[PDB]
Amino acid sequence: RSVYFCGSIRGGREDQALYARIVSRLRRYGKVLTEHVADGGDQFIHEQNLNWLQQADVVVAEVTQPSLGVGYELGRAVALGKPILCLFRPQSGRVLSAMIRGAADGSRFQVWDYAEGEVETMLDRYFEAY
Amino acid sequence: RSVYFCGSIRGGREDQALYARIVSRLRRYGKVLTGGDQFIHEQNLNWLQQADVVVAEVTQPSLGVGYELGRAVALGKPILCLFRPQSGRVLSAMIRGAADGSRFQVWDYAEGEVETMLDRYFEAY
Numbered sequence A: 001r002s003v004y005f006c007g008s009i010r011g012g013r014e015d016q017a018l019y020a021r022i023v024s025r026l027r028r029y030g031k032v033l034t035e036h037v038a039d040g041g042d043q044f045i046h047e048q049n050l051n052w053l054q055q056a057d058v059v060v061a062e063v064t065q066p067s068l069g070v071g072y073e074l075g076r077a078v079a080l081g082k083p084i085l086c087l088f089r090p091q092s093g094r095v096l097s098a099m100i101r102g103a104a105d106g107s108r109f110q111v112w113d114y115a116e117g118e119v120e121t122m123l124d125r126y127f128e129a130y
Numbered sequence B: 001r002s003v004y005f006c007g008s009i010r011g012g013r014e015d016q017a018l019y020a021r022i023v024s025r026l027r028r029y030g031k032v033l034t035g036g037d038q039f040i041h042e043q044n045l046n047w048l049q050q051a052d053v054v055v056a057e058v059t060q061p062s063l064g065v066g067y068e069l070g071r072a073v074a075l076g077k078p079i080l081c082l083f084r085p086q087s088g089r090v091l092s093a094m095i096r097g098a099a100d101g102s103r104f105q106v107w108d109y110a111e112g113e114v115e116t117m118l119d120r121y122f123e124a125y
């Protein structure tokens, strides 16, 4: 089973520690294809990621930090019909993009509010139901 | 003929005045098309499917602008991305790496140059 994890890089690395926790937890549920997010130029990066996205069985995104790449990955993922879980922290004090919040089906595309400490329990809840 | 314009909102409205200028200039080249959030998403995707060209100002990081570009690429839309390196920011590798120089172009520009960059692209067309 393949999992594609999305999180901000050039959008900012403020949530890196949280990304590492998410990736560690995701390894219980499959192979994390994009593990370097939590640590040939741009063309290669893009194509390598697109190939991984096509292979992935599920896409998990932490969407608290605004990022073009995370948004782009989610857009491509929806077009591929992938099951998507977005995780957002309201305590950040920001309001989540209407385009992400509004993409929610509440089934194939889920957007869940969580508190920083609960990330592991949220992922367990999703992958128990998956 | 019809144009979808993308720019950061909840990502930050720092460049809002610039966006307005982009939109004014786009009017010469086509019709600019652009629960609560569910409706906004549905409306925008409808416009995106109808669009003949997609233009995005990608200087301010934004999930929504990224998502629009992802959806637009999957639909094979011609895409122009405009980026300001004098902002001090480095552009997303996923956006820059998506470019192919034809159906997906990324153009670096300086403050005051945006209209001429638009004129060139739409004169291609």
Ligand SMILES: O=P(O)(O)OC[C@H]1O[C@@H](n2cnc3c(NC4CCCC4)ncnc32)[C@H](O)[C@@H]1O
Residues within 6 Å of the ligand: A005, A006, A007, A008, A009, A010, A011, A012, A034, A036, A037, A045, A049, A066, A067, A068, A069, A070, A073, B091, B092, B093, B094
């Ligand atoms: O850099 P932004 O915040 O626009 O996008 C981050 C998202 O887009 C993908 N991404 C962005 N830059 C990446 C990247 N960059 C290289 C590794 C560090 C410097 C260049 N490598 C792999 N994936 C990348 C990641 O999977 C991540 O989820």
Ligand SMILES: O=P(O)(O)OC[C@H]1O[C@@H](n2cnc3c(NC4CCCC4)ncnc32)[C@H](O)[C@@H]1O
Residues within 6 Å of the ligand: A096, A097, A098, A099, B005, B006, B007, B008, B009, B010, B011, B012, B034, B040, B044, B062, B063, B064, B065, B068
């Ligand atoms: O809000 P972010 O920065 O994630 O995304 C902005 C992009 O996504 C679309 N968008 C986001 N919020 C929108 C919106 N209303 C939101 C609901 C209250 C104000 C913002 N109305 C129309 N389009 C919107 C725009 O076309 C814009 O290009």
